[PDB]
Design a protein around this nucleic acid. Structure first.
Lengths: 285, 109, 109, 109, 285
DNA sequence: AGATATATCTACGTTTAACAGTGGCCTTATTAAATGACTTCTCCATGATCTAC
């Protein structure tokens, strides 16, 4: 068949400055753009999470064509010819050297900020009376939960068993490129909405919304719940876990809604184990 | 809601009814075309309320005012709550409530 | 809309009517060709309003001033709402509202 | 213009009339000497407004200045609108509006 | 094997003017921004804690490249060629020339105030008579406890034994940059939440949350415990110590809760000694 | 038993006046980024010539 895995992930609450764009003057602007309701939100690029997954695969001991020398801060190639059969990163993320190119199983979108960006900035200055042009500086930061959408094609993987390490990496994502010295923002998931279906149609993209414009509440969006009510997006193929489970269970008439008969687990590890068992049963692994 | 505020409101009503009784008494006292002294009576009531020196003073006064008011139906239905509220709470707070009731009786007539 | 704001507005009106009553009282008190003290009275009211030291202070004064105002219809219409507003709420916000009312009685005359 | 802009304009005019009253009081009180302080008074007013740190203190100072000003024709014509604007809107925005009114004060020709 | 030490510690109650932002007028603006529930919270820069740890390392042996003069108010470099193999400072905090550039072993987040900041302003005058433009000034303070989150990659240290001095310094943090003359705020911690695990998945972010407007109760949280109850963040990997232990032991059903079997020590020194023993055993020191 | 007129004592006076801060300052220094990168491949149009039917 043709099985695919789609998910929208929400991160914890903390101060983040992970995606500084081209800075102006003395202030290091973090990249931002418009989103729901026309309010500016801060974005963390999908390439950063792809790099984080590559680093996870490198660290866990898998082959990985691209080796990242941490001390040299340089990237080296184990072999000049890409071999998706042998290398996990070439299998999943694809390649184009300019065969020659691969489509790439993992398809990920940007990481948006659940809460609009007010414009908070932080001043940093070099200590000591001896002050030069590089003495003081301003760094922009944001206190938000980040949400990104990803989609992978199980069939497109050259080795079907490679889907397990990618899921493990998503649940155990290493540092996402940012400023860990002064804004160490953990990108570990704390609420998932996963869909594992044979049809492609996906209705879980950015299914998270804020209760108040400046708050750490992170309630489920009305559109997603309503669409589950209406009849599509089969609850048997739905996988929701994390902190949103409590809010869903505190909703009224929850025992009667179709959300009740969907895979919901308070502990994320249990939901991941169940989804991995389902995937291994479906793909003959 | 908020039962202590219920006691406060029924105290307001009790005070208003007692002063209604006192007003009826003084209207009965006067005769012929002289204007019955009521604004003067209100001023006297306020002044006597202001004059007090804690505890026994102004408590004997409130009891005497309730007695001279006559029969208080709200007090009749709410004996225990009113008595407990009067016995407790700072006397200054009760004086403030009584002054609010002084300004709160006009919608009666 | 936002019934708390409605209560705040009607409290402003109540305080304005009370100051109207006190203005009528002082105008009645003055005699001969002497200028009735109104600016002096307003400044005295503002000075006494600023002078206050929490709870009992300025709440006794609020109640006494409302009583001095006499018959006030806006307070007549709404008993429980204004009574609860006076008993509740931090006294400083009530001072803000009363001061505003000082500045917003002048529309009446 | 929408309603909010009209309310903001009346607030600016209200503050300007209050400053008119305060400056008139300053002129009358200190007619002795070459000239009463107004520029120093304006600087002190700005310093006091910038001193205010939260909604309570800033609203207290604003109400005190408003009552100190005197009769306020712009605040006469609009009681409820301006009162609700003051109570509801965040105190910082009120500070911007007051400072803009300060900078926009047209001297009397 | 990879190892990380994530932790969030809470400071003592007291006045704070540590991180003046811009000094708008006469008001030395204590730096602040929005946080949980949309209330303005005062912030202490993470670079301040990094500087405090640098100073602690310099004060007690522990060869560092950057020496703080303490007399000329200037920073001196013993050797411009940064050598993480020898210096503690280069090995721990990293460097950037603008060579190797390191990565930094310690990742810090900005300290947040556990209580919202209303106005907390203070006057300032200079004796009497002969007053100039410098005579009158204002200073903002804040009477709360501060909370920040930090994480070290243990394996990334060039010398694995260098993890011990940072723990000693965090337990014994010197003056954090701020108005020590007027507002002497000790940044020593009184309640610790440490976790020592072998995978990056890093919960125990700013768990300490009490709100309760103006108070000093400093209750732990509801979500963190929820997590602990659910099954992840296994208690064997958790370390809790400080005054928060007293509150924790008074919770009902604490004997049956999974939080009981975590390493709980009311005294901070005992918990730190136990954590040091565990780290030394695991890293082969 | 029903319908109706009558009787009920204080009370009063409830602050008069004058003021509602006078002064001086409303930040002094300094720094206003430090680096490096500024697409990456291919996909050509047209005519002479070779060659198969």
């Amino acid at each position: 068949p043709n099985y695919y895995l789609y998910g929208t992930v929400l991160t914890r609450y903390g101060l983040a400055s992970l995606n500084h764009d081209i800075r102006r003057g003395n202030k290091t602007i973090l990249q931002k753009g418009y989103w729901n309701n026309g309010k500016i939100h801060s974005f963390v690029g999908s390439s950063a999470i792809r790099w984080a997954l590559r680093f996870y695969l490198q660290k866990q001991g898998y082959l990985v064509n691209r080796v990242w020398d941490e001390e040299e801060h340089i990237n080296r190639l184990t072999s000049e010819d890409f071999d998706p059969e042998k290398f996990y990163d070439d299998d999943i993320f694809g390649f184009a050297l300019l065969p020659n190119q691969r489509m790439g199983a993992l398809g990920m979108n940007m990481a948006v900020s659940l809460t609009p960006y007010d414009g908070a900035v932080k001043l940093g200055a070099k200590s000591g009376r001896e002050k030069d042009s590089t003495s003081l500086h301003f760094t922009e930061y944001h206190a938000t939960r980040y949400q990104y959408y990803f989609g992978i094609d199980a069939t497109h993987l050259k080795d079907f068993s490679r889907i397990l390490p990618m899921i493990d990496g998503i649940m155990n994502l290493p540092k996402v490129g940012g400023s860990s010295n002064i804004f160490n923002y953990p990108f570990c998931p704390d609420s998932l909405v996963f869909q594992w279906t044979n049809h492609f149609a996906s209705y879980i993209s950015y299914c998270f919304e804020y209760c108040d414009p400046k708050s750490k509440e992170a309630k489920l969006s009305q559109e997603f719940i309503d669409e589950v009510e209406c009849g599509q997006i089969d609850p048997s193929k739905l996988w929701i876990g994390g902190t949103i489970v409590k809010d869903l269970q505190q909703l009224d008439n929850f025992e009667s809604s179709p959300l009740n008969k969907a895979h919901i687990y308070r502990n994320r590890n249990e939901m991941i184990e169940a989804l991995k068992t389902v995937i291994k049963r479906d793909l003959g692994l | 809601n908020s039962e202590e505020d219920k006691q406060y409101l029924i105290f307001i009503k009790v005070f208003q009814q007692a002063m209604k009784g006192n007003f009826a008494k003084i209207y009965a006292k006067t005769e012929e075309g002289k204007d019955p002294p009521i604004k003067k009576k209100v001023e006297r009531l306020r002044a006597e309320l202001n004059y007090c020196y804690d505890e026994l003073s102004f408590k004997e006064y409130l009891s005497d005012f309730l007695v001279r008011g006559g029969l208080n139906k709200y007090f009749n239905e709410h004996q225990e709550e009113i008595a407990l509220l009067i016995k407790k709470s700072p006397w200054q707070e009760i004086r403030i409530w009584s002054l609010l009731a002084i300004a709160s009786y006009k919608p009666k007539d």
